[PDB]
Design a protein around this ligand. Structure first.
Ligand SMILES: *Cc1c(COP(=O)(O)O)cnc(C)c1O
Ligand SMILES: *Cc1c(COP(=O)(O)O)cnc(C)c1O
Lengths: 396, 396
């Protein structure tokens, strides 16, 4: 039965891991996958997380199955983090949250839910964008369409082209937006642009689907959610797929959530029962450990304070590497101006390097980036900055 | 968009949890979901697990993403547990294992893999059986067919009817077998019957898919895998979905595996790349905690010894509750003979109660069982045995 199965094409992002371990030479620099590194080039477990794990080890009395939607406290805390402490969506009980295995798992659950319970046939994603989006929605039987977003010549958000691109989107179509720290451009809409988009969305009857994997990496927890909250004030329905992989450094514990919002509590509950049905035939119930860590931290004043400071330190170290990167590039004979990199937020930098330049950096310099020219700034340290910039200057 | 979504039908097994919390009266007895309870009626964390979690808390240095297939040690140890220490399947590198979120997650991964990478169109499951099987395979677009299995009049495995039922199965069809502790009959084929089945399977060209969620609950770790090993000796290809939810008491951490076997290493690797592609568009990579606990225990001689003894104690307590159940039933005026319950292995008892009797036990006695008449013996304690048997005798 398996004689004729064909080898699967490598993943443009996940596949980098395979090439890295395969490469033996020393001095390799991993600027591929979006993982935070500290000044020493390691991805440590946060102190707040270690303390929460300590608490769980001493107070946990059973590993008995969680409900299909997961830990309730986790859901409450996630909703507060997304919509704000005293949000009306929470007061009117218009939102339902299912704990899922990572933000990717939330997208999959959203995809299966939409495919068999609604008339949705098309999902609009940005270009440039995150490849996994297309792969996940296509796997559920939904077609993916792309909308313009980036002005490569001016290194800015091409709002005009974005709006014109979306005019081709019909009512009932799903439009996916990155909450903040757009992957991979790092360029987000201003509050006024978000407001215009929220207004345009209601008017044309689109179903907003927010992918929120970097809350806290742009400006702050509350500020980074302003766009989403702008939409939530106008819309009766929406979907939010969020992840705690980066802001909690819980990558491998797979901690995320899929939040559903409807016009009222009876409608959301009815729709949510079908979301649970989708989860039931996938992994049944979610993994407790990671989500339990998040709930413990967010619900304990002391731990939350420590975590929030650790998040701030991560955001600040990336900002510093971002400025050291630009300076070191020009300092070593940078062919052109890379000041546009300072205005990008998040872990990445959409450098503008071509596919061949990225390939060359990999083969003769041992520097790994994504073929799109996306580099992980969070992967830069004071130690690898010099050799890193020297390789880039050599391929320009 | 969500105005007209219909409420999802309740799950025959998972739904019991919702009715239990909704029921306020005291004295409720949960004999529904397959979860182990100790003499006190609680589902404790195993001591070996607590020790492994202790080790992880002190030695873990990062939560960085695991590869798509999970922790390699976990896979190695899982293969050894399934096929035996020095198995030829392991020597010839004919098997590939992906760590998955629970045994249900492994089934889903197997389902998606088969649906888009092979000609498989039909999956054969037993009747009586486990409802989630049909739901998972149907969700992937595969049709489910049922084969006879139980002799309700003699409380035995109707081998004749099983064979005749499967003659309608064509080559290229998938046939699902429960490794041991058949859910819900608790009646497994003898070694000789397994051998006959392995022989019949090869001859008719079926693709075996084993669901192994109770290894160690029938007779022992090695003995419980004899059937599977009988098949693995004859077949060139097969699939095994296993779970550590019960034998490790790690229900909510979602620890399972999907093992693929092919004629040779180049074929399995090629086919496995497509299995990873299936996982990639679902949850990306698996949750580390639970699987890391399992790997730690199985690879440490000291911890493994403690765990194995804890497994033995669980199996033995269930056997004792099984005999106390029968005695207490006749002792209180049991209408008929329930000695057939002693010969069933695993956590359950296929009692023979009708749907109405089960409904009545629930509504006026507060005793919860599955509509199929399946009762969780592992949920019985010396404390609830009396009231439990009195309710059952009243509905007979
Ligand atoms: C990292 C990321 C996610 C989710 O990641 P998980 O590891 O699955 O939690 C989702 N969307 C984008 C754009 C991301 O960068
Ligand atoms: C319990 C069980 C499983 C898997 O359970 P998970 O909780 O998903 O690990 C699979 N098949 C049967 C027949 C089971 O009883």
């Amino acid at each position: 039965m398996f004689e004729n199965i064909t080898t699967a094409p490598a993943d443009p992002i996940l596949g980098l891991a395979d090439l890295l371990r395969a490469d033996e030479r020393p001095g390799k620099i991993d600027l591929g996958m979006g993982v935070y590194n500290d000044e020493t080039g390691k991805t440590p477990v946060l102190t707040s997380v270690k303390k929460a794990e300590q608490y769980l080890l001493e107070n946990e009395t059973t590993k008995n199955y969680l409900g299909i939607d997961g830990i309730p406290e986790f859901g409450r805390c996630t909703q507060e983090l997304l919509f704000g402490k005293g949000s009306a969506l929470i007061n009117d009980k218009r939102a339902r949250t299912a704990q899922t295995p990572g933000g990717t798992g939330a997208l999959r659950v959203a995809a299966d839910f939409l495919a068999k319970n609604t008339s949705v046939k098309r999902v609009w994603v940005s270009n440039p964008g995150w490849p996994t989006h297309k792969s996940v929605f296509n796997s559920a039987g939904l077609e993916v369409r792309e909308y313009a977003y980036y002005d490569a010549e001016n290194h800015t958000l091409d709002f005009d082209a974005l709006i014109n691109s979306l005019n081709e989107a019909q009512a009932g179509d799903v439009v996916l937006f990155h909450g903040c720290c757009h992957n991979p451009t790092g360029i987000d809409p201003t509050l006024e642009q978000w407001q215009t988009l929220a207004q345009l969305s209601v008017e044309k009857g689109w179903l907003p689907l927010f992918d929120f994997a970097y809350q806290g990496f742009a400006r702050g927890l509350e500020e980074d959610a302003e766009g989403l909250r702008a939409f939530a004030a106008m819309h009766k329905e929406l979907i939010v797929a969020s992840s705690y992989s980066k802001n909690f450094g819980l990558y491998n514990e797979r901690v995320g959530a899929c939040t559903l919002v409807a016009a009222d509590s009876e409608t959301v509950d009815r729709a949510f029962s079908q979301m649970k049905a989708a989860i039931r035939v996938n992994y049944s119930s979610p993994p407790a450990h990671g989500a339990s860590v998040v709930a413990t931290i967010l619900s304990n004043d002391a731990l939350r304070a420590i975590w929030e400071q650790e998040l701030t330190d991560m955001r600040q170290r990336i900002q510093r590497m971002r400025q050291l990167f630009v300076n070191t590039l020009q300092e070593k004979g940078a062919n052109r101006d890379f000041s546009f990199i300072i205005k990008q937020n998040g872990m990445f930098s959409f450098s503008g390097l071509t596919k061949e330049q990225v390939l060359r950096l990999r083969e003769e310099f041992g520097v790994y980036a994504v073929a799109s020219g996306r580099v992980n700034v969070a992967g830069m340290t004071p130690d690898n900055m010099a050799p890193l910039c020297e390789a880039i200057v050599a391929v320009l």
